[PDB]
Amino acid sequence: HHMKIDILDKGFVELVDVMGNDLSAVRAARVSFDMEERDRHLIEYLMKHGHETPFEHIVFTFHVKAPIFVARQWFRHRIASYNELSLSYEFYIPSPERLEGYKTTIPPERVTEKISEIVDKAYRTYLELIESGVPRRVARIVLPLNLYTRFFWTVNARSLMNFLNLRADSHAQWEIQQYALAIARIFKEKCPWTFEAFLKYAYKGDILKE
Amino acid sequence: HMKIDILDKGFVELVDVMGNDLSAVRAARVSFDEERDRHLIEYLMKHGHETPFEHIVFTFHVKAPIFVARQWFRHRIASYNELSGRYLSYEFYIPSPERLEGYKTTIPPERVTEKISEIVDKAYRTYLELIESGVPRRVARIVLPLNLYTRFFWTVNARSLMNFLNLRADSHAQWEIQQYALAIARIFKEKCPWTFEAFLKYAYKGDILKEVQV
Amino acid sequence: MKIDILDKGFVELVDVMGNDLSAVRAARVSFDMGLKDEERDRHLIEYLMKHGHETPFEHIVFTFHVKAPIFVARQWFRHRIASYNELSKLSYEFYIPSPERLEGYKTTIPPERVTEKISEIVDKAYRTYLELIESGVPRRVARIVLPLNLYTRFFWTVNARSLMNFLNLRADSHAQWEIQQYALAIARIFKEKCPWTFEAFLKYAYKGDILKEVQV
Amino acid sequence: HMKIDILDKGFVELVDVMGNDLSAVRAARVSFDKDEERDRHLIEYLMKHGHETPFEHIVFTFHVKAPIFVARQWFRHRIASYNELRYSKLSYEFYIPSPERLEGYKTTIPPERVTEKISEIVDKAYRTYLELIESGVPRRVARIVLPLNLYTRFFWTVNARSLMNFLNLRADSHAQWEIQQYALAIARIFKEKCPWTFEAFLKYAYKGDIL
Ligand SMILES: Cc1cc2nc3c(=O)[nH]c(=O)nc-3n(C[C@H](O)[C@H](O)[C@H](O)COP(=O)(O)OP(=O)(O)OC[C@H]3O[C@@H](n4cnc5c(N)ncnc54)[C@H](O)[C@@H]3O)c2cc1C
Ligand SMILES: Cc1cc2nc3c(=O)[nH]c(=O)nc-3n(C[C@H](O)[C@H](O)[C@H](O)COP(=O)(O)OP(=O)(O)OC[C@H]3O[C@@H](n4cnc5c(N)ncnc54)[C@H](O)[C@@H]3O)c2cc1C
Ligand SMILES: Cc1cc2nc3c(=O)[nH]c(=O)nc-3n(C[C@H](O)[C@H](O)[C@H](O)COP(=O)(O)OP(=O)(O)OC[C@H]3O[C@@H](n4cnc5c(N)ncnc54)[C@H](O)[C@@H]3O)c2cc1C
Ligand SMILES: Cc1cc2nc3c(=O)[nH]c(=O)nc-3n(C[C@H](O)[C@H](O)[C@H](O)COP(=O)(O)OP(=O)(O)OC[C@H]3O[C@@H](n4cnc5c(N)ncnc54)[C@H](O)[C@@H]3O)c2cc1C
Ligand SMILES: O=c1ccn([C@H]2C[C@H](O)[C@@H](COP(=O)(O)O)O2)c(=O)[nH]1
Ligand SMILES: O=c1ccn([C@H]2C[C@H](O)[C@@H](COP(=O)(O)O)O2)c(=O)[nH]1
Ligand SMILES: O=c1ccn([C@H]2C[C@H](O)[C@@H](COP(=O)(O)O)O2)c(=O)[nH]1
Ligand SMILES: O=c1ccn([C@H]2C[C@H](O)[C@@H](COP(=O)(O)O)O2)c(=O)[nH]1
């Protein structure tokens, strides 16, 4: 198992590992070792009726590189395991296209440039404070929320479906939607029957059926 | 699949596993030399950094008496699917005579064993007569004894499994679940030998796994 | 508040943290009570429930004391997002289904005789238990002969969001009748303590059948 | 009611509490229906043997105002409930370390100058934030330039067992100093409301140094 999807300017979602497949839910539901029409029908049956515990026996590990404002939202998802890096310094700079629909009173390129400029100033201050003898944990508090971080995320398919309901949705901020779309893409590749049944029966958001 | 027999008719069988010792190293490093990797495992265990071990996950298939399952299912940080009937066999745990020896008893331990057998057969007979009379299964089943075997799948990460071993692979736990915990330990050790050894050395709070190999 | 359930069971409220307004204060992140406005606060509860913002309800918490048969407790304890403490001084009482429990089904003996047969095997299993305990068998070994209808007791501490999940699944005709009866009591106490949350739960979020038909 | 100021603008305040020491005792005994010495002895017994489940039946709600870098560490504690500040209005304040914060480390510029440089960035970053917002950039996008020392507020509902785990990890000299200060206040409130449980915790179970 290995997939990697680039997100934003420097981000990514990378698949590290997966335990199981669609049939792992079928086996869990039946408490059996079965290894097709009947099995798809059971997955659909479980999804329609909200019998989601069998999907907890499918597990993914992802490696995610995302800005802190994104990771902070993501880490609100309690039913999962996280290890975050505690070092490189890179920042998410929104592209000009990101800023359209909004009739900004300055050109979107200049908004991009203003963001780049303040990020550069904060980063230079951070580096000065460090070279001055300030400990990193203190100096780092000037750094902006668009600083990239990386983490490992281990999550089961049920909790992943919850994650997608909330984040693969127009009510979510655009940046996390882009991460959710990549998470969805990998889920679909690894668990096509579960994913399709999720979309058909259980998915509460808008963007995945668009 | 590794399958270890426990009690008279029980077992623990490994269904699947995600990762191995290196899964905790990669998670600690957040990064996708064998002695350096082993050193990190010991370091994490020694200094109480337990979260990397959540990235190693097991699924077991367990057949156990209900009184054992009831204790086991108290472990909340795990996923369970138990046999019900709408997606059964009827066997019962009968303790061996050796199970009961030591406790000063008034009758012989083999008679205690037969007295348990006798009451199990009477209760199962009543269950069958109720069923064949039209009583629905999940009402008739309430007369069956707590030593009735059940089966379940259990998906559990290594951190939670280690908590489970602390509590159940220990002489304060009832002897029956101790036996199941010993089997869970054997499998954990086989798949994650570096984690297991570090766990014994630095974090394990129980008594039995320091003395009983595997 | 204590409500009798089945022949010897009960649900008893031990404690409660908060009320409907606890969810409102958590949603707003404000412990400012000098601007209370009932209409506004009740509208927020509805809005949260309507749009699936469930986390504010986690700041209302209950503790119950429940006496139920083991086969009921086994189902109930599958609800992981909660805290349990079960009895391990002990009493020995068993749930014997009433004749009316066992009609609706076409039994080939009278429902009366089913009750008698269940009572009789319970008595026999209990006598055997006692015989083994007098003989020197440790109590935790002798008890394995006791039937699944043996009563147990537990404390259950659970937040309102998890409680609503419990009601979705257990206050429902797909649940076994015995745990339905317990869920109806749990619902009654929830409604008494958090009436606005309960009402909005039924209107917008509740997935089961029974609570929409059966008052309280 | 109980409020403790933390850092330059932060706080921990107690919103509510369910139960007290006797809630763990009732839970352990499974008994709703006095003997002080016996009840203290049970609490000590549970703590020293690691029978921690009874302490799950004591629950707290706190209202906390903390910089984001502190809140990021705190929210890693999963066995709890959080609501962070659309429903309520937003203010913009930032944690500026005091010069004494930098005492011990031998810096190449005076500590007051470090304070000053941190204030400079806050001002410039916040001024850029406002420029971007006045220009039609959405707040959720403009705010990405703001530093990690921006204050946020949240409600935290947590049981006493989970609170003890939090204190083990955060009331400790290995935790960053700022979250230590918050943990100290959490511990104080816990001590006030559950003195027997807290005392037993220090005696037998607490793994940190600072408490
Ligand atoms: C020897 C022995 C005797 C026992 N006697 C009794 C008895 O008399 N009565 C009885 O009811 N039970 C009894 N138990 C069961 C025991 O109280 C626990 O329910 C069981 O051991 C599971 O432990 P756990 O909570 O650590 O595991 P899990 O429930 O898997 O939790 C793992 C860890 O996650 C954390 N956690 C998970 N959920 C919560 C939460 N809601 N709040 C705070 N932290 C949480 C804790 O840190 C916990 O250690 C006994 C267990 C043992 C081993
Ligand atoms: C009518 C009916 C028939 C049933 N038949 C069976 C059966 O045949 N076999 C059987 O084993 N069980 C059966 N159950 C039990 C069922 O599978 C659940 O264990 C039980 O209802 C608890 O529900 P829950 O997981 O939503 O609740 P909780 O365990 O309290 O969890 C609450 C919520 O937290 C989330 N959650 C908690 N832990 C995890 C986790 N580890 N991973 C992902 N998400 C998590 C989920 O969103 C869940 O809704 C049955 C239940 C009902 C109501
Ligand atoms: C000094 C210090 C340095 C740190 N450095 C880093 C770092 O570099 N990177 C980093 O990512 N984090 C770091 N952390 C965060 C740390 O790894 C934990 O996320 C945090 O301390 C919360 O601990 P917890 O999991 O015990 O608490 P909770 O998340 O509240 O869990 C409570 C208890 O429940 C159990 N539990 C809950 N969920 C699960 C689960 N899914 N699986 C198994 N068991 C579970 C565990 O027994 C746990 O003890 C650091 C913390 C400290 C104190
Ligand atoms: C569009 C949008 C706007 C948001 N705005 C805000 C905001 O303003 N403030 C804010 O704080 N957060 C906000 N959030 C975050 C939101 O409150 C949740 O924290 C986040 O969506 C995680 O959802 P969850 O609890 O279902 O996931 P998890 O935390 O993984 O929980 C998974 C499931 O387990 C169950 N569960 C887990 N733990 C508990 C528990 N302790 N009690 C009861 N059930 C539990 C629930 O059934 C839950 O669905 C927002 C999210 C979205 C998508
Ligand atoms: O869309 C949202 C809005 C808020 N939050 C949570 C994450 C933070 O804990 C807090 C504030 O997030 P921001 O609105 O600052 O992104 O609420 C989300 O998870 N998603
Ligand atoms: O060693 C024990 C003793 C008790 N319990 C829990 C399981 C049940 O929820 C309840 C009663 O268990 P018995 O003592 O009746 O097995 O307490 C355990 O998990 N382990
Ligand atoms: O309605 C049900 C059916 C099953 N189970 C869970 C409880 C047990 O863990 C297992 C089997 O329960 P019974 O069907 O045998 O009650 O599945 C429930 O929780 N509720
Ligand atoms: O003392 C620490 C160090 C790290 N982390 C977690 C929180 C973040 O998710 C991530 C990085 O935190 P910082 O070291 O960057 O604060 O690791 C903590 O909780 N406490």
Coordinates of N, CA, C and O in Angstrom, one line a residue, chain A residues 68-69 71-72 75-76 78 80-84 92 94 98-99 102-106 111 114-115 118 121-122 125 128-129 132-135 137-138 140-146 173, chain D residues 68-69 72-73 75-76 78 80-82 84 95 97 101-102 105 107-109 114 117-118 120-121 124-125 128 131-132 134-138 140-141 143-149 176:
Chain A
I68 N -0.8 24.4 10.1 CA -1.3 24.3 11.5 C -2.9 24.6 11.6 O -3.6 23.9 12.3
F69 N -3.4 25.6 10.9 CA -4.8 25.9 11.0 C -5.7 24.7 10.6 O -6.8 24.5 11.1
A71 N -4.5 21.4 10.6 CA -4.2 20.3 11.6 C -5.0 20.5 12.8 O -5.5 19.5 13.4
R72 N -5.2 21.8 13.3 CA -5.9 22.0 14.5 C -7.4 21.6 14.4 O -8.0 21.1 15.4
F75 N -7.4 17.6 14.2 CA -7.1 16.9 15.5 C -8.3 17.0 16.5 O -8.2 16.4 17.6
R76 N -9.4 17.7 16.1 CA -10.6 17.7 16.9 C -11.3 16.3 16.8 O -12.2 16.0 17.7
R78 N -11.4 13.0 17.7 CA -10.9 12.3 18.9 C -10.7 10.8 18.7 O -9.8 10.2 19.4
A80 N -9.3 8.4 17.0 CA -8.2 8.3 16.0 C -6.9 8.5 16.9 O -6.9 8.9 18.0
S81 N -5.8 8.1 16.2 CA -4.4 8.2 16.8 C -3.6 9.1 16.0 O -3.6 9.1 14.8
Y82 N -2.8 10.0 16.7 CA -2.0 11.0 16.1 C -0.6 11.0 16.6 O -0.4 10.8 17.8
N83 N 0.4 11.2 15.8 CA 1.8 11.6 16.2 C 2.2 12.7 15.3 O 2.2 12.6 14.1
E84 N 2.5 13.9 15.9 CA 2.9 15.0 15.1 C 4.4 15.3 15.3 O 4.9 15.0 16.4
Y92 N 2.1 27.8 4.1 CA 1.0 27.8 3.0 C 0.7 29.3 2.6 O 0.1 30.1 3.3
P94 N -1.7 31.1 0.0 CA -2.8 30.9 -0.9 C -2.6 31.5 -2.2 O -2.0 32.7 -2.3
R98 N -7.4 31.2 -5.4 CA -8.1 31.0 -4.1 C -9.0 32.1 -3.6 O -9.9 31.9 -2.9
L99 N -8.7 33.3 -4.1 CA -9.3 34.5 -3.5 C -10.3 35.2 -4.4 O -10.6 36.3 -4.3
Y102 N -14.7 36.6 -4.0 CA -14.5 37.7 -3.2 C -14.0 38.8 -4.0 O -13.0 38.8 -4.6
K103 N -14.8 39.9 -4.0 CA -14.4 41.1 -4.8 C -13.5 41.9 -3.9 O -13.8 42.9 -3.3
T104 N -12.2 41.4 -3.8 CA -11.2 42.1 -3.0 C -10.9 43.5 -3.6 O -10.8 43.6 -4.8
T105 N -10.7 44.5 -2.7 CA -10.4 45.8 -3.2 C -8.9 46.0 -3.4 O -8.4 47.1 -3.7
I106 N -8.1 44.9 -3.4 CA -6.8 44.9 -4.0 C -6.6 43.6 -4.8 O -7.3 42.6 -4.5
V111 N -2.8 40.4 -2.4 CA -3.1 39.7 -1.2 C -2.1 38.6 -0.9 O -1.6 38.5 0.2
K114 N 1.1 40.2 0.2 CA 1.0 40.7 1.6 C 1.1 39.5 2.5 O 1.7 39.7 3.6
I115 N 0.6 38.4 2.2 CA 0.6 37.2 3.1 C 2.1 36.7 3.1 O 2.6 36.4 4.2
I118 N 4.3 39.2 5.4 CA 4.2 39.1 6.8 C 4.7 37.7 7.3 O 5.4 37.7 8.3
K121 N 8.5 38.1 7.4 CA 8.9 38.9 8.6 C 8.8 38.1 9.9 O 9.8 38.2 10.7
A122 N 7.7 37.3 10.1 CA 7.6 36.5 11.3 C 8.7 35.4 11.4 O 9.3 35.2 12.4
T125 N 12.0 37.0 12.3 CA 12.0 37.3 13.7 C 12.3 36.0 14.5 O 13.1 36.0 15.4
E128 N 16.0 35.2 14.2 CA 16.7 36.1 15.0 C 16.6 35.7 16.5 O 17.7 35.7 17.2
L129 N 15.4 35.5 17.0 CA 15.2 35.1 18.4 C 16.0 33.9 18.7 O 16.6 33.8 19.8
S132 N 19.7 34.6 18.9 CA 19.9 35.4 20.1 C 20.0 34.5 21.4 O 20.2 35.1 22.4
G133 N 19.7 33.2 21.3 CA 19.7 32.4 22.5 C 18.3 32.0 23.0 O 18.2 31.3 24.0
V134 N 17.2 32.5 22.5 CA 15.8 32.2 22.9 C 15.5 30.7 22.6 O 15.8 30.2 21.5
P135 N 15.0 29.9 23.5 CA 14.6 28.6 23.2 C 13.6 28.5 22.2 O 12.7 29.3 22.1
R137 N 11.0 26.7 21.8 CA 9.5 26.5 22.1 C 8.9 27.9 22.5 O 7.7 28.1 22.4
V138 N 9.7 28.8 22.8 CA 9.3 30.2 23.1 C 9.4 31.0 21.8 O 8.4 31.6 21.4
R140 N 9.1 30.1 18.8 CA 8.2 29.7 17.8 C 6.8 30.3 17.9 O 6.0 30.2 17.0
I141 N 6.5 31.0 19.0 CA 5.1 31.5 19.2 C 4.8 32.7 18.3 O 3.7 33.1 18.2
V142 N 5.8 33.2 17.6 CA 5.6 34.3 16.7 C 5.2 33.8 15.3 O 4.9 34.6 14.4
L143 N 5.3 32.5 15.1 CA 5.2 32.0 13.8 C 3.6 31.9 13.5 O 2.8 31.7 14.4
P144 N 3.3 32.1 12.2 CA 1.9 32.2 11.9 C 1.2 30.8 11.7 O 1.9 29.8 11.5
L145 N -0.1 30.8 11.7 CA -0.9 29.6 11.7 C -0.8 28.8 10.4 O -1.3 27.6 10.3
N146 N -0.3 29.4 9.3 CA -0.1 28.7 8.0 C 1.2 28.0 7.9 O 1.6 27.5 6.9
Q173 N -14.1 24.9 5.8 CA -13.1 25.7 5.1 C -12.5 25.0 3.9 O -12.2 23.8 4.0
Chain D
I68 N -3.0 29.8 21.5 CA -3.2 28.6 20.6 C -2.1 27.5 20.7 O -2.5 26.3 20.7
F69 N -0.9 27.9 20.9 CA 0.2 26.8 21.0 C -0.1 26.0 22.3 O 0.2 24.8 22.3
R72 N -3.3 23.8 21.5 CA -2.9 22.7 20.6 C -2.4 21.5 21.3 O -2.6 20.3 20.9
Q73 N -1.6 21.7 22.4 CA -1.1 20.7 23.2 C -2.2 20.1 24.0 O -2.4 18.9 24.1
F75 N -5.5 20.0 23.6 CA -6.5 19.3 22.9 C -6.1 17.9 22.4 O -6.9 17.1 21.8
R76 N -4.8 17.6 22.6 CA -4.4 16.2 22.3 C -4.9 15.2 23.3 O -4.9 14.0 23.0
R78 N -7.6 13.3 24.4 CA -8.8 12.9 23.6 C -10.0 12.5 24.5 O -11.1 12.6 24.0
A80 N -12.1 13.6 26.7 CA -12.7 14.8 27.2 C -13.5 15.4 26.1 O -13.5 15.0 24.9
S81 N -14.2 16.5 26.4 CA -15.1 17.2 25.5 C -14.7 18.7 25.4 O -14.3 19.2 26.5
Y82 N -14.6 19.2 24.2 CA -14.1 20.6 24.0 C -15.1 21.3 23.2 O -15.7 20.8 22.3
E84 N -14.6 25.1 21.4 CA -13.8 26.3 21.2 C -14.5 27.4 20.5 O -15.4 27.2 19.7
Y95 N -0.4 36.5 23.7 CA 0.5 36.3 24.9 C 1.8 36.8 24.6 O 2.5 36.3 23.7
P97 N 5.3 37.0 26.4 CA 6.1 36.5 27.5 C 6.7 37.6 28.3 O 7.1 38.7 27.8
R101 N 10.3 35.4 32.1 CA 10.1 34.1 31.4 C 11.4 33.6 30.8 O 11.7 32.4 30.7
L102 N 12.3 34.6 30.4 CA 13.5 34.3 29.7 C 14.7 34.3 30.6 O 15.9 34.3 30.2
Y105 N 18.2 31.4 30.6 CA 18.8 31.3 29.3 C 19.6 32.6 29.0 O 19.1 33.7 29.2
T107 N 20.8 35.1 26.9 CA 20.5 35.6 25.6 C 21.4 36.8 25.2 O 21.9 37.5 26.0
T108 N 21.6 36.8 23.8 CA 22.5 37.8 23.2 C 21.9 39.2 23.1 O 22.6 40.1 22.7
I109 N 20.6 39.3 23.4 CA 20.0 40.6 23.5 C 19.2 40.6 24.8 O 18.8 39.5 25.3
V114 N 13.6 41.0 23.7 CA 12.9 39.8 23.2 C 11.4 40.0 23.2 O 10.6 39.7 22.3
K117 N 10.3 42.4 20.5 CA 10.3 41.9 19.2 C 9.1 41.0 19.0 O 8.6 40.9 17.9
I118 N 8.7 40.3 20.0 CA 7.5 39.5 20.0 C 6.2 40.4 19.8 O 5.4 40.1 19.0
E120 N 6.2 43.4 18.5 CA 6.3 43.9 17.1 C 5.6 43.0 16.1 O 4.9 43.5 15.3
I121 N 6.0 41.7 16.1 CA 5.4 40.8 15.2 C 3.9 40.7 15.4 O 3.1 40.7 14.4
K124 N 2.3 43.7 13.8 CA 2.4 43.8 12.4 C 1.5 42.7 11.8 O 0.9 43.0 10.7
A125 N 1.5 41.5 12.4 CA 0.7 40.5 11.9 C -0.8 40.8 12.0 O -1.6 40.6 11.1
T128 N -1.7 43.4 9.5 CA -1.9 42.8 8.2 C -3.2 42.1 8.1 O -3.9 42.2 7.1
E131 N -5.9 44.7 7.5 CA -5.8 45.2 6.1 C -6.5 44.2 5.2 O -7.2 44.6 4.3
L132 N -6.1 42.9 5.4 CA -6.7 41.9 4.5 C -8.2 41.8 4.6 O -8.9 41.7 3.6
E134 N -10.3 44.2 5.7 CA -10.9 45.4 5.1 C -10.9 45.4 3.6 O -11.7 46.2 2.9
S135 N -10.1 44.6 3.0 CA -9.9 44.5 1.5 C -10.8 43.5 0.9 O -10.8 43.3 -0.3
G136 N -11.6 42.8 1.7 CA -12.6 41.7 1.1 C -12.1 40.3 1.3 O -12.8 39.4 0.9
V137 N -10.9 40.1 1.8 CA -10.5 38.7 2.2 C -11.3 38.1 3.3 O -11.4 38.8 4.4
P138 N -11.8 36.9 3.2 CA -12.6 36.3 4.3 C -11.7 36.1 5.5 O -10.6 35.7 5.4
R140 N -11.6 33.8 7.7 CA -11.1 32.4 7.8 C -9.8 32.3 7.0 O -9.0 31.4 7.4
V141 N -9.6 33.1 6.0 CA -8.4 33.1 5.2 C -7.4 34.1 5.8 O -6.2 33.8 5.9
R143 N -7.0 35.2 8.7 CA -6.4 34.8 10.0 C -5.2 33.9 10.0 O -4.6 33.7 11.0
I144 N -4.9 33.3 8.8 CA -3.8 32.4 8.7 C -2.4 33.1 9.0 O -1.4 32.4 9.2
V145 N -2.4 34.4 8.9 CA -1.2 35.1 9.1 C -0.9 35.4 10.6 O 0.1 35.9 11.0
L146 N -1.9 35.1 11.5 CA -1.8 35.5 12.9 C -0.9 34.4 13.6 O -1.0 33.3 13.3
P147 N -0.2 34.9 14.6 CA 0.8 34.0 15.3 C 0.2 33.1 16.3 O -1.0 33.3 16.7
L148 N 0.9 32.1 16.6 CA 0.5 31.0 17.5 C 0.2 31.5 19.0 O -0.4 30.7 19.8
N149 N 0.6 32.7 19.3 CA 0.4 33.2 20.6 C -0.9 34.0 20.8 O -1.2 34.5 21.8
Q176 N 6.0 22.1 28.5 CA 6.4 23.4 28.3 C 5.9 24.3 29.5 O 4.8 24.0 30.0

